[PDB]
Assembly symmetry: C3
Homo-oligomer: 308 residues x 3
């Protein structure tokens, strides 16, 4: 009865809030929602594997529509030896350290690794974030190349260079057409014992006021599979008005789709594995301001993550 | 290749009809449809489990839209010992004996059992029935507490008290805003040998003409997993105009969404397991009348249930 | 952890193009898309099985909407002995050799085989093709009976007779109501060693200019599960203006929904299994013309199929 497909997944019960209305839910300052994902990992052969993930989001109490299931991921991974790998279809792409974009991606990905230095090249389109709601003609294409070297036993540094074509992006709720963008950046990720010190800087060369950077300190040994593991970190975000932030890997409430004059503030988050494969995560963004000094709304998070 | 997720499901081919048009399908007196559900039961750890169910409904011959898959269930079950259990997310809630509501429920559920007496407390929102099509602000919240005691070896009696906040409910196809409702009720379920005698009574204290009750007799040993098992029962429904019937557990064609002056009539249903995990079910509602004596339309059912 | 359900599926990355715009994508002459399907094969009992398939289509770069998951197949298969089989629900029906229709089908199917001669009878509605977008009342019902005999060790010939009721079909993008149609046809499928020579002819007796036929030659031993297997074939299509072509089993770009005066041209396609359960398929339709001699647009195909 067993085949080549292995079924995994996760469940999440998340709470989001803010001191002002509209940050997470329209005309309100709170949002409680749940997520259920089921992933099918299939072994096509010894060197080829295919991953299909079905995802469903619902809001607690929202019965206007059902929780429609959408194919979040659909891609095939090829292992062309021991150092070369390739992806094609609908997968997850991390542009740089994830500050610019870490979300769904349609296209192809090429990997050339050496266990101490890694080269990744991706060509395709972004799906979520400011790239959401764009047709194929209106969606800018991303030609991304990235370098990642291991500076220590587990610390790593790297950089990237990306090229975005003309397309429509969501700027403060308004889709505007932008010219070509050449986005380059660098990142660092140091991890000594339990201490963590990471940072990332990115900028679009041709667009002014496009600089965005982040930096944070952490301490912990969090692992959702191990009970009792905990983590604490506090990171600072400084992104300008024209900084390309489509779907960031971090949990700040402000990106290109929500801000018209950039974002600048701190965020403290904690993690705790209450049980095995069960983790409690909380976050609190404070001192949120625009690049002109205008105060923004403080935001806070609390979610429960179940892994199976 | 095996993980923590076990895949189950069911399939149904159902036929519904009536002597008048509009009871089941608009502008017609018949409805043939099929249902396919796939459920993923996952063991997060020794004391935590998560259930995700994907459901798809289609009509025989309706090709206007595809059979969109919706996440019917998405919840996590915790076992806090041997007597305390907890649920959270999108699950199934039975308010009382199921006459008032037995369908999808967003919120949290707490269980305290003793193997002879059980206490269940739920807080959240109803999704299907008269609560369908309501946003989070317009969906009334349910604060439900229920008691269930075992009066015999397998017979049981119980009661419940529910509190519904202000919200919009579907009354005869029209969504009207209602004030707070305090719904209380009692039920009995006697099962001696093969004979079954059950009944339920519920009423909203502050709303007049809100009384609803049912009673039925049965005889059989139906079990879909066992071939040759059969069941027959005949039950009578008497629900008034303002009686809260959102999504009843029984198969009467008339509830709050379809009736403007209540429902009152009999219903005879039969069950038969033609094969293992295959069951043939039929039903026939007759003598359907309003609370004022106006005749309603007789309805009849026939479905095939496949379990896997 | 293992149950009665076995999980299979497939993934596809397809490219389609033409010399004229609108053949595959509106206002463009190209279309790159991907497909991911997950099928759940369940054993209800020793003689009953149920199949549920979840399907998701996405376009590379189209982020206007998510890849909604739809239940492509939902049906139950019964084995009433060793020669009689039955299907019910949403399955795949091949009307004749597949030239007229080979796609989703709602209804019931009966099979009576003898390992050398087979009789198949289906009653229901077509879902895809020219039958897409039709409600239950507007969808014509198909009463189909088919005969298939084995003329050689692996060659086979057969025929069919179909009866279509009044209903709406998509004719060149316009849904028109048509009277009853009695469609009959014959087919032949010869397979000697690696050579293949097949053909099919169909016609609606009461509709004029409803004749449609195809013929092709092939050579290969293609099997996606075996690496290195390859196939080549070239087939010719001659279908008239009123010929019923709802969802053909072949890959010609022109059918009843796209053509107003029929289709007539050649098509050469190749297959190659680059890896185990991975296959590369290409096609090229050329010399496309109408039944009046007006030139149509040449089309070409290229897809990658992954099986798991």
């Amino acid at each position: 009865r067993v085949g080549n497909v292995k079924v995994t997944g996760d469940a999440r019960i998340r709470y989001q809030g803010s001191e002002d209305k509209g940050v997470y839910k329209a005309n309100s300052k709170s949002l409680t929602d749940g997520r259920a994902r089921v992933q099918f990992n299939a072994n096509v052969n010894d060197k080829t594997q295919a991953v299909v993930r079905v995802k469903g989001n619902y809001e607690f109490g929202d019965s206007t529509k059902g929780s429609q299931a959408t194919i979040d991921r659909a891609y095939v991974d090829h292992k062309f030896g021991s150092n070369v790998s390739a992806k094609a279809g609908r997968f997850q792409q991390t542009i740089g350290g994830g500050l610019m974009y870490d979300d769904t991606f349609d296209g192809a990905q090429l990997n050339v690794g050496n266990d101490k230095v890694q080269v990744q090249g991706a060509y395709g389109y972004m799906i979520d974030g400011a790239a959401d709601g764009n047709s194929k003609s209106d969606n800018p294409s991303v030609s991304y190349v990235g370098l990642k070297g291991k500076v220590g036993k587990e610390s790593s540094v790297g950089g990237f260079y990306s090229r975005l074509s003309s397309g429509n992006l969501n700027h403060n709720g308004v889709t505007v057409n932008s010219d070509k963008q050449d986005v380059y950046g660098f990142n660092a990720d140091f991890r000594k014992n339990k201490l963590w010190a990471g940072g990332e800087w990115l900028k679009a060369s041709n667009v002014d006021n496009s600089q965005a950077w982040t930096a944070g300190l952490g301490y912990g040994n969090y692992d959702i599979a191990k009970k009792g593991t905990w983590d604490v970190k506090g990171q600072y975000f400084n992104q300008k008005a024209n900084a390309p932030i489509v779907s960031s890997t971090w949990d700040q409430a402000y990106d290109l789709t929500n801000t018209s004059n950039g974002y600048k503030g701190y965020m403290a988050s904690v993690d705790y594995a209450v049980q095995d494969n069960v983790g409690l995560s909380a976050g609190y963004g404070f001192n949120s301001k625009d690049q002109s000094g205008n105060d923004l709304s403080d935001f806070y998070r609390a979610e429960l993550n179940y892994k199976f």
